[PDB]
């Protein structure tokens, strides 16, 4: 989960909303077993 710790702070003449993007991946130790149709 993602929580607001503080309010979103901007100087004047600046847009008040923004975005965040997440990127998923697996590590080196990730493994797979017994192939199956999708």
């Amino acid at each position: 989960t993602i929580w607001y710790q503080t309010n979103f702070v901007v100087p004047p003449d600046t847009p008040t909303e923004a975005n965040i993007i997440a990127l998923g991946a697996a590590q080196k130790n990730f493994t797979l077993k017994l192939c199956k149709d999708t």
Partner: protein, 48 residues
């Protein structure tokens, strides 16, 4: 994600994952976020 689509071709999987967060706002913006992770047994937090 690509890890999620090629898990649908297999019956079992195990290991560690990572997640990356990019903030796309203006160079002038400032603030803080709190990013929490709850283990498999527990329900999600009610409060900050």
């Amino acid at each position: 994600t690509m890890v999620g689509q090629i898990c649908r071709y297999y019956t079992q999987w195990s290991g560690s994952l990572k997640v990356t967060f990019m903030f796309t706002g203006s160079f002038m913006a400032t603030g803080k976020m709190l990013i929490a992770y709850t283990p498999p047994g527990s329900a999600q937090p009610a409060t900050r």
